Write a protein that binds this ligand. Structure first.
Ligand SMILES: CC1(C)S[C@H]([C@H](NC(=O)Cc2ccccc2)C(=O)O)N[C@H]1C(=O)O
Ligand SMILES: [Zn+2]
Ligand SMILES: [Zn+2]
Ligand SMILES: [Zn+2]
Length: 241
């Protein structure tokens, strides 16, 4: 049983598969959790999503590594047995994009913010194969996100990084904030090394406004939370300015 130093612990409802944990959030939505062991520090959990859309599956975020990300694909094969149509990855850092090669080896079409693809090589990442671009109010340009089914991608503005994006799951009350959003009881906004401290608070709030009826907010390093994750993230970010 894996007990990370950072990230949510295992609760009732969690399934351990290999080195990963999966938790069903809705009839058609699961959270994938992978763990990177830091020397002298212990394991850091990171979360993404798996969405069933009819006879195909959509993924949001890799795991930390190629091998972990292959384990995700293995779980999907075992538990859902449908093909993965595409994956969207939510910015160019290892917890979100560390397993690109595994998606590509599997023949899965990958999508990221054009800016994440531009940043990837500087961040020791592989770029996605397709670039998303965004309107002045943050909504993805729909021609750049073809056949995304329920995934509604929204760029909230610079915050955790300049390239961070978010994803609402249409047809559910779930929205995913990735590393931008921390949980309602967080004491820190996490790693601010690449952050835009001036705009973070507005971006967090913009994510909230983009998906104003999402009641379950999923994020990278805690259990799904209420909308208090958004408001509390914004209040912590207010103090940065
Ligand atoms: C504090 C974090 C959980 S660290 C992670 C990310 N760092 C990495 O992917 C590199 C890495 C490699 C090996 C071990 C740890 C980290 C980043 O810099 O934003 N996201 C942060 C966050 O969500 O606040
Ligand atoms: Zn990051
Ligand atoms: Zn993170
Ligand atoms: Zn960086």
């Amino acid at each position: 049983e894996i007990r990370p130093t950072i990230g949510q612990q295992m609760e009732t409802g969690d399934q351990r598969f290999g080195d990963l944990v999966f938790r069903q959030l809705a009839p058609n939505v699961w959270q994938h959790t992978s763990y990177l062991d830091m020397p002298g520090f212990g394991a850091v959990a990171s979360n993404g999503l798996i969405v069933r859309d009819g006879g195909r599956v959509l993924v949001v975020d890799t795991a930390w590594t190629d091998d972990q990300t292959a384990q995700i694909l293995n779980w999907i094969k075992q538990e859902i047995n449908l093909p993965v149509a595409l994956a969207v990855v939510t910015h160019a850092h290892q917890d979100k994009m560390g397993g690109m090669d595994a998606l590509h080896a599997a023949g899965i079409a990958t999508y990221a913010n054009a800016l994440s693809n531009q940043l990837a090589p500087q961040e020791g990442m592989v770029a996605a194969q397709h670039s998303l671009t965004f309107a002045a109010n943050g909504w993805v340009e729909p021609a750049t996100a073809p056949n995304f089914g329920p995934l509604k991608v929204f760029y909230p503005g610079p915050g955790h990084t300049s390239d961070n994006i978010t994803v609402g799951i249409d047809g559910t009350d779930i929205a995913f904030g990735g590393c931008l959003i921390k949980d309602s009881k967080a004491k820190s906004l996490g790693n601010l090394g690449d952050a835009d401290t001036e705009h973070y608070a507005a971006s967090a709030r913009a994510f909230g406004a983009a998906f104003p009826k999402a009641s379950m907010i999923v994020m990278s390093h805690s259990a799904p939370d209420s909308r208090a994750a958004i408001t509390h993230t914004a209040r912590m970010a207010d103090k940065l300015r």
